[PDB]
Design a protein around this ligand. Structure first.
Ligand code: HEM
Ligand code: HEM
Ligand code: KMA
Ligand code: KMA
Ligand code: H4B
Ligand code: H4B
Ligand code: ZN
Lengths: 420, 414
């Protein structure tokens, strides 16, 4: 079966056959589309769902078939020997270890398969750091520091992922309790207002309970809370000289610097789960570089985040009485101009949403031609401002789940059995 | 099976049971989501005697429930009467009350429509007695004048006779009652609206005398009883237009932009209780972004971004100056400002999406849900600063419904 997608701006039609290799489920049915559900059950991974031999060798075999195909060795003796070796290791030890080459392939293809990621043109240039020999939270801290230094590269950002030991019985998990490696604290005040990043209040409170001495400012970089081998997590402070930040100023508005805004340069997601051949890597922080709107639209202008639209619109002296003045849209553009101006001026890698979406369309067409498709989630790919003046708005997309993959997992403070 | 949707800005959670009453199909499966396909086969559209009575029964069931007469004598009598009429005539006719209910509920069920908070105030014009294209023209002029109301726009639909054997179809060939012509210039580009180049051709290539201008109101091409379609010019005094100026940039007027007040979709199919109304033009009032973002700034449409930005003297060397985004906001300020100045009804995308969230809350509370298509509900600019961006939505197909149908010129047995 073949499936066509049309770009309604250019009339380019592409044909998807890759969806036939889709294994996991979407959450939709013929009678209901769940395409706007944020974290459906099919995109998450409960740690209690630890796999049996029963289901593991078919997942391994399918991964290894894909791997050996990509290296033009399908059906070779190396291929058959590896299948044999993995089979014996499973029935004997109930799990198996990936080779270094397989791990690198797996992590690159999990990103390649991430249908919500607009930055996938870069997928083949991922630096994979093998941390599967790590045993303690202190060792995790050291690996994460090296990831941050490497990825940051003094502003010339480089994509990277660090992969800690895989899940065994779900009782000895490695977890990074931070949602991102670098994030600002948030503090609920007694008067109900929030200081700092409202999205991080709950995690900030955990850190404080675990002994963090909170500066209680608006942009305090959170400590790392790291869990090795299923033990209680431990606190660590990232060396501040490793945390690259950018003060936000506007190229025309001199008062903008006086808002006191900054952001960090390195977006590094650390709470997702990497699935490769049925193995589950519960700690696998990865990082790239920012698209401007992630900071300028969502981080700064979501009502439930720093929420700076009013103050910016006040200082611009826009007509704030009626929404039809579009004072919110005007301030939004100026804030996003400032984010991009500030990063470029400091020579920190950033991409604007016009550039990123145009590159994604080129990536997607290439993937149709060389791979037979490119799974893509329109709801997430379209940028959160100026949607229809980017080319992805007009692009039909097919969403399906391929493995290897990144999955969501429950926050560990909800599942952890505390040792004390 | 009893599903929940969450708003991530407010944490409000709603429970949906209405989807269990879904009848048509989405195009998705458990292995693939087609949520961003413009026109799956299901959203496009002869009925045999067999499929028609269950459809009629389902519709009459929900109608008599809505008036609290489910299981009443009147209900059962109507069921058998339509049953008798289908067995006999191979179709049936709706009572006026059922027609009005069916139309309002087709709008209520339109999961892609952000304006549905207004669904119950729709003015239904019964045109089922119409027999000719001149009669269709008369009915449409009356609709346009009633709906326009000197700029105090009112929602309305006009329903022409239902499909019979599929050979006597009533169709409005225009996609909207009021749209601007488009012509392929000899110099290579496109004058007017590029979206309407084909239809503009079929007007000339059927008789129209085009002014070959940039904002020429297209004539109506009306098809009655399956005959050949006929041209009619809508009286200009009935077509309310708005010159587009900016409340700060005096040069804006020199761009020469205008738009019409009345958005009136004319090419969809209305399905009520199995019956098919192939000609059912309906109208409401614009959300500003429809004109300013899509009509004016789409690259396949009037595509004015570059010209506006040049007149603003923005740095167009690099995309990262966000000159497109700046111009886009100013264009959309001008649209709202112009309509508001001329006292023509318009809603901005902030007000409309806030209204839709309130509508969703009402529908979940009083109906058990509200089918909604996030890809279409979220506005084409400033998506995440509108509340619908953060609102999870369940998309499913309820009937009565509006459906797409093939363009007539591809189907007409000429
Ligand atoms: C290199 C530049 C990159 C850019 C510009 C980029 C951009 C984005 C953006 C804007 C999103 C939407 C998420 C949101 O709005 O919060 C996203 C999602 C995602 N990105 Fe990328 N990304 C990049 C690199 C990477 C890398 C290196 C990885 C992994 C190796 C990755 C994996 C993902 C995944 C898994 C998601 C999906 C999250 C979900 O399913 O909810 N990205 N990306
Ligand atoms: C009164 C104010 C109204 C507003 C502000 C409004 C707004 C919108 C918008 C912005 C869209 C998106 C489609 C596009 O971008 O081209 C839409 C779709 C739609 N509207 Fe409404 N509308 C209104 C009235 C009505 C009425 C009176 C009807 C029918 C009686 C209706 C039926 C529909 C349908 C069926 C669609 C979806 C077409 C599809 O499935 O692709 N609307 N509306
Ligand atoms: C690697 C990377 C690059 C880049 N430009 N941006 C990112 C962050 C995007 C991202 C990537 C990702 F994989 C997961 C998330 C979490 C999204 C949450 C879910 C609810 C609220 N938001 C976010 C990562
Ligand atoms: C009644 C009405 C009100 C309003 N504010 N806007 C409209 C027009 C919106 C609309 C409503 C509708 F039902 C159909 C269409 C045509 C869809 C095409 C196909 C892809 C691009 N557009 C458009 C109608
Ligand atoms: C409900 C809705 O799915 C949710 O708000 C989504 C919409 N699209 C998104 N797209 C991106 N890139 N990031 C997001 O967090 C979201 N949130
Ligand atoms: C391919 C994609 O579905 C297409 O561009 C859609 C996206 N969302 C839309 N949303 C609305 N309201 N109107 C549209 O025409 C579209 N076009
Ligand atoms: Zn779907």
């Amino acid at each position: 079966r073949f499936l066509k997608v049309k770009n309604w701006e250019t009339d380019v039609v592409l044909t998807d056959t890759l969806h036939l290799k889709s294994t996991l489920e979407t959450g939709c049915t013929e009678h209901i589309c769940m395409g706007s559900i944020m974290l459906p059950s099919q995109h998450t991974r409960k740690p209690e769902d630890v796999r049996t031999k029963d289901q593991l060798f078919p997942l391994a075999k399918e991964f290894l078939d894909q791997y050996y195909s990509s290296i033009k060795r399908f059906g070779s003796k190396a291929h058959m020997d590896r299948l044999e070796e993995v089979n014996k290791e499973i029935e004997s030890t109930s799990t198996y270890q990936l080779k270094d080459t397989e791990l690198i392939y797996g992590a690159k293809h999990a990103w390649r398969n991430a249908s919500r990621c607009v930055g996938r043109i870069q997928w083949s240039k991922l630096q994979v750091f093998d941390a599967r020999d790590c045993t303690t939270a202190h060792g995790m801290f050291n690996y994460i520091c090296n990831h941050v230094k490497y990825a940051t590269n003094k502003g010339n950002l480089r994509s990277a992922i660090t992969i800690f030991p895989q899940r065994t019985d779900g009782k000895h998990d490695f977890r990074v309790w931070n949602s991102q490696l670098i994030r600002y604290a948030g503090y609920k005040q007694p008067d109900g207002s929030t200081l700092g990043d409202p999205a991080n209040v709950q995690f900030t409170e955990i850190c404080i309970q675990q002994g963090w001495k909170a500066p209680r400012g608006r942009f305090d970089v959170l400590p790392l809370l790291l869990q090795a081998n299923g033990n209680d997590p431990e606190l660590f402070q990232i060396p501040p000289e490793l945390v690259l930040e950018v003060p936000i100023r506007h190229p025309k508005f001199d008062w903008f610097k006086d808002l006191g805004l900054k952001w960090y340069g390195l977006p590094a997601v650390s709470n997702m789960l990497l699935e490769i051949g049925g193995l589950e890597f519960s700690a696998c922080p990865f990082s790239g570089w920012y698209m401007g709107t992630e900071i300028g639209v969502r981080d700064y202008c979501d009502n439930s985040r720093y929420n700076i639209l009013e103050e910016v619109a006040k200082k611009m002296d826009l007509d704030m009485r009626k929404t039809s003045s579009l004072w919110k849209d005007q301030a939004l553009v100026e804030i996003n101009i400032a984010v991009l101006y500030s990063f470029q001026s400091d020579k920190v890698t950033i991409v604007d949403h016009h550039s990123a979406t145009e590159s994604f369309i080129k990536h997607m067409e290439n993937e149709y031609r060389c791979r037979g498709g490119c799974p893509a989630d329109w709801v997430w790919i379209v940028p959160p401002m100026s949607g229809s003046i980017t080319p992805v708005f007009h692009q039909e997309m097919l969403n399906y789940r391929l493995t290897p993959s990144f999955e969501y997992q429950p926050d560990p403070w909800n599942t952890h059995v505390w040792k004390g």
